[PDB]
Amino acid sequence: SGAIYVGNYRVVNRHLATHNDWANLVWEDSSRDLLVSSTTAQGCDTIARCDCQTGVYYCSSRRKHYPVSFSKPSLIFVEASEYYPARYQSHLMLAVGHSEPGDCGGILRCQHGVVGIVSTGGNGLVGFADVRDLLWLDEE
Ligand SMILES: C[C@H](CS(N)(=O)=O)c1ccccc1
Ligand SMILES: C[C@H](CS(N)(=O)=O)c1ccccc1
Numbered sequence: 434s435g436a437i438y439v440g441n442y443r444v445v446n447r448h449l450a451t452h453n454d455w456a457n458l459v460w461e462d463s464s465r466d467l468l469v470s471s472t473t474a475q476g477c478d479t480i481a482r483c484d485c486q487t488g489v490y491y492c493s494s495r496r497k498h499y500p501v502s503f504s505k506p507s508l509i510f511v512e513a514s515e516y517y518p519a520r521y522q523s524h525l526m527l528a529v530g531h532s533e534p535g536d537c538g539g540i541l542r543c544q545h546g547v548v549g550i551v552s553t554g555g556n557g558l559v560g561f562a563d564v565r566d567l568l569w570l571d572e573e
């Protein structure tokens with residue numbers, strides 16, 4: 434689990450979104466595993482605006498942060514899970530590291546801020562849903 438809180442937005446894994454997230458839906462993309470909902474409280478998170486390929490992610494299944502190199506956001510074939518059939522997930526970044534389903538929502542951070550959230554895993558890889566292209570997360 435986990436979310437990004439920026440302005441009046443909450444960013445979550447689309448497959449972990451709650452009834453309240455869907456009741457307050459701003460934007461969702463099934464191809465990206467992202468959903469953004471509106472919040473009443475102001476979020477303080479800073480979104481990175483950059484092309485970093487190094488950062489640190491939180492891994493709840495190890496209670497640890499790990500430094501990783503990760504690929505630029507791309508269209509990656511992702512195996513079926515129970516939340517999706519096998520499909521191309523877009524805007525996905527891969528790194529070598531540990532990820533279990535409950536790790537979804539762990540933040541990946543660079544020097545500039547929040548890069549994305551854990552979305553996929555298995556075969557010793559971790560996939561992060563990029564958010565850096567969502568420039569609208571920083572206004573109204
Ligand atoms: C929020 C919606 C249904 S509702 N109550 O009409 O908002 C929802 C249904 C199933 C899984 C996740 C979310
Ligand atoms: C079992 C699934 C497979 S997938 N292809 O990543 O959806 C999963 C593993 C680890 C983290 C998140 C999800």
Ligand SMILES: [Zn+2]
Pocket residue numbers: 481482483484485543544545546
């Ligand atoms: Zn950066």
